[model samples]
Target: SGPRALSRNQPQYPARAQALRIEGQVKVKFDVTPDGRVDNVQILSAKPANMFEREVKNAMRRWRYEPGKPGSGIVVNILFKINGTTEIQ
Candidate 1:
């Protein structure tokens, strides 16, 4: 099993998305280094097309995790809500 996330910074909702009232989910996959760094972040799928890809990728790069096996796969689901809230599951 992988280590638990020690810290995560929420992605900022794109202004364009908020202006357009876009709300949906994005699925991402990445590898975690044994030292708890995130790398190789990729978007597996996203609702409303590429609306949230850039922001999610940028934020994922800064996410921190407890030490774990290197090259371990990590999958995350990020939700963008109409109320201007974001959640990771």
Candidate 2:
């Protein structure tokens, strides 16, 4: 079986974006290390940077997964919104 999620630490909304009403989304890819820890996070989708990516990475890195399989990559699309809220997909 593949790594099952134990903890999916959701990211927080950046203050910078809220001030300007900027909403951001990222399609992030990362690997679950053999030790069940989050490995390098790669941003599959690119944006010219206005915040979100780095903060998202920081939050995603804390995510924990079950360790057993040979370890593989996982992808998730997350978004930060003002009218709504931070969410993952």
Candidate 3:
């Protein structure tokens, strides 16, 4: 559409050995319609937690796609990361 925004949250991380321990970003892809809705979301990264994919999809559903050109489709990109280190900050 005209313009749109998307992002990722902490909980969406995959439940792997470092699900809560490891920290990184997860990218998400989806299609937007002129009516302001996101659909066909895909997780571009591989997650060990397994929960990441579902969480990403779930979160994307809440996004409000903006109305744009009739034939134009919107793409959403998201980065989910956990912050913290074994050593004290």
Candidate 4:
């Protein structure tokens, strides 16, 4: 129940979204392998529809989590701000 994040690689704001000035948050649920790898990512929700889904999923794939029980579920809320800053929690 405690899969902590070890490293997070921020995803770039999509060019289209940036051009459109889109900003919002995304919620993702994924599995954390016992070895601390992220896997089976599923987007639970995202504001502005598909705007930041792909980018978030892609970046999350590279994120590393602290070792946990095999098949542990990890949920994350990612924010995409208009200022072009991203945050994960």
Which one is best on TM-score? 1
Q: Candidate 3's residue-wise lDDT over 1-89, tens digit each?
A: 25454432233444553445655445555676767566776776644435556665666677664556222333444444454311100
Clashing residue pairs, candidate 1? none
The local distance difference test score of each candidate is: 0.83, 0.76, 0.50, 0.80
List the candidate 4 regions with Cα displacement exceeding 4 Å.
Answer: 68-71
For model 1, the superposed segments whose C-alpha errors exceed 4 Å read: none
lDDT of 2 by residue, 1-89 (tens): 57777888777777777787877787888888777878878878834263888788888878888877435668888877776387788
Candidate achieving higher lDDT, 1 or 4: 1
lDDT of 3 at 28: 55
Error of 1 at 71 (Å): 4.8
Against the correct fold, how does model 4 do in TM-score? 0.85
Better candidate number, 3 or 4, judged by TM-score: 4
Report the C-alpha displacement of residue 7, candidate 2, in angstroms. Answer: 1.2
- Best candidate (score: lDDT): 1
lDDT of 3 at 87: 14
TM-score of every candidate relative to the true structure: 0.88, 0.84, 0.58, 0.85
RMSD of each: 1.5, 1.9, 6.3, 1.7
Ranked by lDDT, top first: 1, 4, 2, 3
Enumerate residue pairs that collide in model 2: none
In candidate 3, how many Å is residue 35 off? 0.6
